[PDB]
Amino acid sequence: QQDYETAKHSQHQAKQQAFALVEIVQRRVHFSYSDSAGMLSENADLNDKLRQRLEHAESDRSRAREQLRQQQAQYSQFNQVLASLKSSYETKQDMLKEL
């Protein structure tokens, strides 16, 4: 019982620490807003900073789209070879049954 009440207390420590770290993972996109906070401090015309932040985001988005297209093509190729093996196993199995 002494070891088990200690394990229950240890589980609570892990849950509160992990919950705090998980909240920061949800807030990952909010840390990128440091530029938005610096932009807010301009208190005057800032359309150039807005367009620069957007152009960087456009460059990142374009690289991500290219990366996604080539991975989707590679995944489809792997899926067709896997299906080719499945069908080869089915015909070999049917031939074993027929023999």
Partner 1 sequence: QEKIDRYQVDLEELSYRLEEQTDVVEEAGELQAEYEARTEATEQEVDELKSQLADYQQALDVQQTRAIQYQQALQALERARELCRLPDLSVDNAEEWLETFQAKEQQATEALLALEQKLSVADAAHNQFEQAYQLVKNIVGETSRSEA
Report the interface residues with partner 1, using CB under 8 A. Answer: 1, 3-4, 7-8, 10-12, 14-28, 30-31, 33-34, 36-40, 42-43, 45-47, 50-51, 53-54, 57-58, 60-61, 64-65, 67-68, 71-72, 74-75, 78-79, 81-82, 85-86, 88-89, 92-93, 95-96, 99
Radius of gyration over every alpha carbon of the chain, rounded to an integer in angstroms: 27
Q: Which amino acid is at 40?
A: L
Asked whether the beta carbons of 60 and 52 are under 8 A apart, the reply is no
CA-nearest of 62, 56, 65 to 36 is 56
Task: Using CB under 8 A, list all residues that contact its own copies.
Answer: 76, 79-81, 83-88, 90-92, 95
